[PDB]
Amino acid sequence: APITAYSQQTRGLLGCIITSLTGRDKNQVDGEVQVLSTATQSFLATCVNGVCWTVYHGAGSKTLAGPKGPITQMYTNVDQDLVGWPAPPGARSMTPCTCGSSDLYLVTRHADVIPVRRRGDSRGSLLSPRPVSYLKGSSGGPLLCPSGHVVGIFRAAVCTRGVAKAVDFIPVESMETTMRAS
Amino acid sequence: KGSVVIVGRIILS
Ligand SMILES: C=C[C@@H]1C[C@]1(NC(=O)[C@@H]1C[C@@H](Oc2cc(-c3csc(NC(=O)C(C)C)n3)nc3cc(OC)ccc23)CN1C(=O)[C@@H](NC(=O)OC1CCCC1)C(C)(C)C)C(=O)O
Numbered sequence: 001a002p003i004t005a006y007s008q009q010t011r012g013l014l015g016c017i018i019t020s021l022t023g024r025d026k027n028q029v030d031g032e033v034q035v036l037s038t039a040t041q042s043f044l045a046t047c048v049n050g051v052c053w054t055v056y057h058g059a060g061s062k063t064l065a066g067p068k069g070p071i072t073q074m075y076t077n078v079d080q081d082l083v084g085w086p087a088p089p090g091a092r093s094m095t096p097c098t099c100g101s102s103d104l105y106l107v108t109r110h111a112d113v114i115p116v117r118r119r120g121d122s123r124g125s126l127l128s129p130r131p132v133s134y135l136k137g138s139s140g141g142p143l144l145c146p147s148g149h150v151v152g153i154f155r156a157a158v159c160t161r162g163v164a165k166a167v168d169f170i171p172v173e174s175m176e177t178t179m180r181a182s
Numbered sequence: 183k184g185s186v187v188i189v190g191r192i193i194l195s
């Protein structure tokens with residue numbers, strides 16, 4: 001894989017409960033991908049054209065804790081499992097992929113970069129099988145073309161007896177379809 | 183009622 005990644009934590013379990021309740025986060029923001037938490041689960045958000053995109057089944061209808069207080073969702077599509085908030089200052093906006101390269105790369109919450117073979121518009125095969133538990137918490141994470149552009153975000157895993165052989169994702173196209181119906 | 187919180191980030195190269 002050409003692409004690499006590392007993570008940096010910003011908050012602990014306590015300051016997260018606090019920030020959750022005040023909706024106000026002073027921490028400086030960086031990175032293409034944000035690691036997000038509610039009370040009951042963790043997941044990922046990918047910034048693309050100034051919107052922080054993630055899944056509904058992680059974020060629900062919630063606000064994002066921000067510097068000027070809670071940020072209201074700018075896009076909400078329950079049935080796509082997609083939501084987006086305006087990207088906080090300093091998040092690194094990613095660029096959409098359109099060249100349609102066949103081999104993709106999933107970035108997990110562990111900052112691992114996993115080879116995927118595109119099988120269709122919103123489906124991708126894992127060249128190498130992984131535990132479901134290993135992917136759990138990476139919904140919202142980006143699938144990248146080899147150039148580092150974003151093709152989609154991770155939505156669900158195709159799996160059997162706790163082993164995942166494929167990923168279902170929201171193609172960067174659907175993020176247009178929600179924006180138009182705004 | 184609780185807002186979602188950024189607890190970390192991932193840097194890409
Ligand atoms: C293991 C990792 C995987 C990435 C991951 N995702 C997840 O955990 C996702 C979330 C949920 O899937 C969906 C939820 C909602 C959804 C909408 S609203 C809602 N919840 C609520 O309203 C509650 C508040 C009540 N859920 N909408 C979807 C829409 C889809 O459209 C094509 C596909 C999957 C969806 C189950 N799942 C799966 O990955 C599950 N797989 C699964 O459902 O099979 C998928 C369906 C499409 C391809 C194969 C699994 C691994 C638990 C058996 C994660 O980390 O969260």
Ligand code: NA
Pocket residue numbers: 004005006007110111112113
């Ligand atoms: Na890494």
